[PDB]
Amino acid sequence: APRLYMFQTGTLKCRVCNIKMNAGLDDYEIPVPWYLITHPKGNVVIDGGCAVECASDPKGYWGDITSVYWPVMRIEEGCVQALKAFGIEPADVRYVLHSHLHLDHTGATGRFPNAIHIVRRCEYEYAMAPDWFSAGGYIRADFDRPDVKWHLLEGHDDGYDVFGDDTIRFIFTPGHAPGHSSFLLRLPETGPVLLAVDAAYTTDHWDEKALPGFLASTVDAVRSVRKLHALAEKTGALVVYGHDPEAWPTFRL
């Protein structure tokens, strides 16, 4: 029966303003979550965190963006590595799901050779052709790989049900990135779990006391938060914020 495991590729060191827009220039540190869903029909990885290469050579693999987001992580936190130790070989992953293609969410891409990769077309298309302000958050060595099998979702695909049994559904949440998606999970014992990912970094974002410090569209981002508000109230879901260093320890990790 299906289960949800919450992992973390270490942390990112940045400023408060990168998380909470115009909030200040103090140092600040955030977890990098990623998720595994074990399912009778196959295992699912969501995003995979920062690329394992960041544990050894961040400046070489990410480049100048490291002056903004410094990744603090060990080699064994790499998604492939963490999974091997957990007992799942890279070949035993049926799906990689992507909320979006930012640099702390593409560690899984191409690392699971049998996995279909599911993401919004417009995220893939923006990733390949970013604007200058966001070009550094997209690592082509992660997501630009000819060997990858992609399922690129269209605008009408909101709610896409990965297995067709309501276990995992994409919940489109544009704004933080053009093709950003959250996920609604339904587990037999826990019930519904809402993975906001970067549609709501922190409880302050969810409560409309902060704007994301990086974003493609503020108009979409705040409407997407309210869309999640309605979804959380309808389902009673447990809400998991994308990058909340105060709430992250309170969940099952």
Per CB under 8 A, contacts with its own copies among 48-77 are none
Which of the ranges 112-120, 158-166, 198-206, 215-223 carries the binding residues for Ni ion, by CB under 5 A?
A: 198-206
Residue 158 binds which entry of Ni ion, its own copies, none, CB below 5-8 Å type-dependent: its own copies
Three-class secondary structure of residue 26 per DSSP: coil
Place of tokens 């490291």: 66
Return the one option of Ni ion, its own copies, none that residue 234 interacts with (CB less than 5 to 8 A, by type). its own copies
Q: Does 223 sit near its own copies (CB under 8 A)? A: yes
Interface with its own copies in residues 143-162 (CB under 8 A): 150-152, 154-156, 158, 162
Q: Phi then psi for 127, rounded to 5 degrees?
A: -50, -45
Alpha-carbon distance of 35 to 203, in angstroms, equals 20
> Measured between alpha carbons, how far is 227 from 191 in angstroms, rounded to an integer?
20
CA 217 to chain centre: 18
Interface mask toward its own copies for 92-131; x: CB under 8 A = ------------------------x-x-----xx--xx-x
Return the H-helix or E-strand segment holding 27.
strand 27-38
| Residue number, 39 or 153, with CB nearest to Ni ion | 153
> Of the candidates 102, 111, 117, 169, which one interacts with Ni ion according to CB under 5 A?
102
Burial grade of 97 (CB within 10 A; 0-12, 13-18, 19 or more): buried
One-letter amino acid for residue 163 of the chain: F
Number of residues that bind its own copies (CB under 8 A): 47
Q: Is the Cβ–Cβ distance between 33 and 6 less than 8 Å?
A: yes
CA distance 117 to 110: 8
Q: Is 104 in the site for Ni ion (CB under 5 A)?
A: yes
The nearer residue to Ni ion, 134 or 235, going by C-beta atoms, is 134
Of 6, 8, 13, 17, the residue at the interface with its own copies (CB under 8 A) is 17
Q: Contact positions toward Ni ion, by CB under 5 A?
A: 102, 104, 198
